Amino acid sequence: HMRVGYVSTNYSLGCKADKTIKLSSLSEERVLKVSSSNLLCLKNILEWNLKHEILFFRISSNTIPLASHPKFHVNWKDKLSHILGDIGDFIKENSIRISMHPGQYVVLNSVREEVVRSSIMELKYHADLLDSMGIEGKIQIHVGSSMNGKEESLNRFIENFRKLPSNISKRLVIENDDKVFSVKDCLWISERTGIPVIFDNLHHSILNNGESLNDALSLVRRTWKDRPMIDYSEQEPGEKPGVHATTINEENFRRFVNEVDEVDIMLEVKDKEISALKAVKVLKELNKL
């Protein structure tokens, strides 16, 4: 009862789904050209993934390049409605679960009004992309800044969250990080907002309040109405703490899954689909796929 995913693009297939363009290259034609090629490759990836028993995917934020930039005014929702609807049908037809992660420049709890504004613009593009596919999906973010200290920063997150439009807020999920905001801190936010928490195992291993894997999982499960998503990674040997592994280690992964069930696992390792294949092989063997 576990789905496996990987993030953004598939290197083996050779259809790049995560291409972006420089601000200096912005034009309607170029945005439509790179969006179309990204989306073609995304459809090809989702097809490949279904055949390889990989039923979770993290769609790249580069899918429509520069979509939330102030100078961007391309009507991609109409112009690409065809391919967008087609990809969404394939996802809903085949029970594929979807997440997106806008990354570090979304800082929903910034003290700077213009940073909050641009962060909401980026979140609105993610909700628009998912809406254009006719699917639900989750948009995962970190809590953000710790300016003025942790408690002020948690309350600024909750305040600004409560100003979001529903098509973003209904999809939003928060994840623990390895520097400031722990599982405990995310659970404090969830209790006051209903936001589900994505558990990231490597981050928790680095920054925690003593909770075991199982206890932290059980806590985070209660924040979801549906099956939880978790982010699985490992430490790259020899690197600074928190640097993500270049591939999963099968024995580490086996030790993790033997503890867990009824969760969709997103692999955040640098060899992408190659690790997703190793994980499908383990899960099938353990009758947990």
Chain positions contacting Mn ion, by CB under 5 A: 200, 231
Closest approach of Cβ 233 to Mn ion, in Å?
6
Q: How, if at all, do strands 2-7 and 56-58 pair?
A: parallel
Q: Distance between CA 273 and CA 30 in Å, rounded?
A: 28
Strands (E), 76-165: 97-100, 138-142
Beta carbon nearer to Mn ion, 185 or 200: 200
Read off the tokens for 157. Answer: 């997150």
* Residue whose beta carbon is closest to Mn ion: 231
Beta carbon nearer to Mn ion, 31 or 266: 266
- AA letter at 224: W
Closest approach of Cβ 74 to Mn ion, in Å?
30
Beta carbon nearer to Mn ion, 231 or 273: 231
Partners of 2 in beta bridges: 263
Closest approach of Cβ 195 to Mn ion, in Å?
16
Cβ-contact 157, 189 below 8 angstroms: yes
Annotated binding-site positions for Mn(2+): 175, 200, 231, 268
Closest approach of Cβ 71 to Mn ion, in Å?
31
Partners of 142 in beta bridges: 175
Closest approach of Cβ 175 to Mn ion, in Å?
6
Q: Distance between CA 256 and CA 40 in Å, rounded?
A: 34
Closest approach of Cβ 145 to Mn ion, in Å?
18
CB atoms within 10 A of CB 288: 15
Cβ-contact 61, 15 below 8 angstroms: no
Beta carbon nearer to Mn ion, 64 or 174: 174
Annotated binding-site positions: 175, 200, 231, 268
Q: Distance between CA 36 and CA 43 in Å, rounded?
A: 11
Q: Distance between CA 39 and CA 1 in Å, rounded?
A: 29
Beta carbon nearer to Mn ion, 66 or 229: 229
Beta carbon nearer to Mn ion, 13 or 206: 206
